[PDB]
């Protein structure tokens, strides 16, 4: 990548890594660090990327106000138009049939893979910064600069507003068993919540804004990305397990391999880095 990497995701078998960048591309990489494809078509910075559960479809989010759907070989399949400002994040439903997009226009939109707008989730009072599907597919979680996470059903009905962060919420993730919700915030914390909206834990330790959060596939490990240039690994009890050091600028996103053994981090230093659960740096994708 020729500019900041803004997001990273692992394919379902973890053999392919997808990276989003301000250079307006998504790049696809093998686990061994070889560049496989560069997906070209967005007209401004790409802000996030997601793999479909089948590993065949890639979704990308962009400042050009669209989501694009791509196949694993780089073909553009759909352009999802409807947001009135920058799209900041994207997620697939667990059945791969629905795409959720987050936008500076203060909404989440829901789309089918044919590109039809299914629903607009309205309620946030400021930019929406990230979106996640519950692993049962029945709930949508959104993160916002209005300092909240909101939970929604597919009907667009607001279910819960999770309040407590003292600054913008930058990202959101469901645990693989759907029992826990993690949120990242400019207030330098990750907070863990249950589905009732109750705060379970506040993870403290990062020295600057937290930009993204992810669960291991067994839900036992939480990874957080920060402007303090680290990824931190945490257990469910909130204990800090590791600090992954090596990026030379802000870390913007993080993801786990499907066996939870490898962590991918995205950075403004224009790289993706791969790490072991032990905290050891493994590889750097440039």
The region, left, alpha or beta by phi > 0 then psi within -120 to 50, assigned to residue 255 is: beta
Q: 252, 176, 165, 256: which is closest to 212 by C-alpha?
A: 252
Q: 12, 34, 8, 28: which is closest to 74 by C-alpha?
A: 28
Between CA 57 and CA 19 the distance in angstroms is 14
Q: 151, 182, 150, 189: which is closest to 167 by C-alpha?
A: 189
Q: Is 124 annotated as a binding residue?
A: yes
Contact 180, 200 (CB under 8 A): yes
Both structure tokens of 269 = 């230093």
Return the DSSP state at 249.
Answer: S
Binding residues for Zn(2+): 124
Binding residues: 124
């Amino acid at each position: 990548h020729s500019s900041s990497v803004t997001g990273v995701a692992f394919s379902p078998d973890g053999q392919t890594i997808a990276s989003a960048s301000d250079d307006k591309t998504v790049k696809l990489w093998n686990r061994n660090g070889q560049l496989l494809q560069t997906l070209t078509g967005h007209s401004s910075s790409v802000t996030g990327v997601a793999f479909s559960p089948d590993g065949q479809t890639i979704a990308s989010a962009s400042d050009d106000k669209t989501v694009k759907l791509w196949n694993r070989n780089g073909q553009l399949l759909q352009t999802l138009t409807g947001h009135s400002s920058s799209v900041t994040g994207v997620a697939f439903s667990p059945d791969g049939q629905t795409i959720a997009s987050a936008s500076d226009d203060k909404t989440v939109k829901l789309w089918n893979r044919n590109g039809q707008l299914l629903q607009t989730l309205t309620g946030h009072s400021s930019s929406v910064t990230g979106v996640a599907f519950s692993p049962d597919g029945q709930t949508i979680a959104s993160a916002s600069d209005d300092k909240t996470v909101k939970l929604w059903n597919r009907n667009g009905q607001l279910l819960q507003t999770l309040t407590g962060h003292s600054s913008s919420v930058t990202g959101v993730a469901f645990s693989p068993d759907g029992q826990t919700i993690a949120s990242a915030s400019d207030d330098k914390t990750v907070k863990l919540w249950n589905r009732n909206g109750q705060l379970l834990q506040t993870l403290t330790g990062h020295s600057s804004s937290v930009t993204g959060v992810a669960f291991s596939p067994d839900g036992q490990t939480i990874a957080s990305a920060s402007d303090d240039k680290t990824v931190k690994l945490w257990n469910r009890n909130g204990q800090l397990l590791q600090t992954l050091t090596g990026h030379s600028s802000s870390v913007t996103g993080v993801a786990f391999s499907p066996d939870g053994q490898t962590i991918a981090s995205a950075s403004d230093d224009k790289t993706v880095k791969l790490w072991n659960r032990n905290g050891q740096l493994l590889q750097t994708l440039t």
